[PDB]
């Protein structure tokens, strides 16, 4: 069912679900998965307001199409970002880091799953990269 649809989802251009892209914050590491567990909190403080969109884990980079504006916000790529990283709070929050090469510094973006399950997006992304290097 779920995986029976997520199997070809990443292969297409949408293997995730509604998300809460808070924005982007600065970090000082970009060499660990725990770095995202902290950034997610920073964006939860203030300034960076969350957005209700639709994360589409595509094998050629993620894409968050707003579900209230459809103007898109995250036109980045999976192979472009340093490396993904979940959390250890409630598995309802994920984030990715992106150092220099486009920001001239370490900048990690954070977001949260509006589905609350830790499978419709988590495991989905964990399979995206596995297919990204298929060739």
């Amino acid at each position: 069912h779920q995986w029976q649809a997520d199997e070809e989802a990443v292969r297409s251009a949408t293997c995730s679900f509604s998300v809460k892209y808070l924005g982007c914050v600065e970090v000082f590491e970009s060499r660990g998965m725990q770095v995202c567990e902290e950034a997610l909190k920073v964006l939860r403080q203030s300034r960076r307001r969350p957005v209700r969109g639709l994360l589409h884990v595509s094998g050629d980079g993620l894409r968050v199409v707003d579900d209230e504006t459809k103007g898109l916000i995250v036109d980045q790529t999976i192979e472009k970002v340093s490396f993904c990283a979940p959390d250890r709070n409630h598995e309802r929050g994920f984030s990715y880091i992106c150092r220099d090469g486009t920001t001239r510094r370490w900048m990690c973006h954070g977001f949260l799953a509006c589905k609350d399950s830790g499978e419709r997006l988590s495991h989905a992304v964990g399979c995206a990269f596995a297919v990204c290097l298929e060739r």
């Binding site: 999976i78 472009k80 340093s82 490396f83 979940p86 992304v125 995206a128 990204c132």
Partner: peptide, 11 residues
């Protein structure tokens, strides 16, 4: 606890 591997390895 995962991370992409098909990265282009940025400087």
């Amino acid at each position: 606890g995962f991370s992409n591997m098909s990265f282009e390895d940025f400087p």
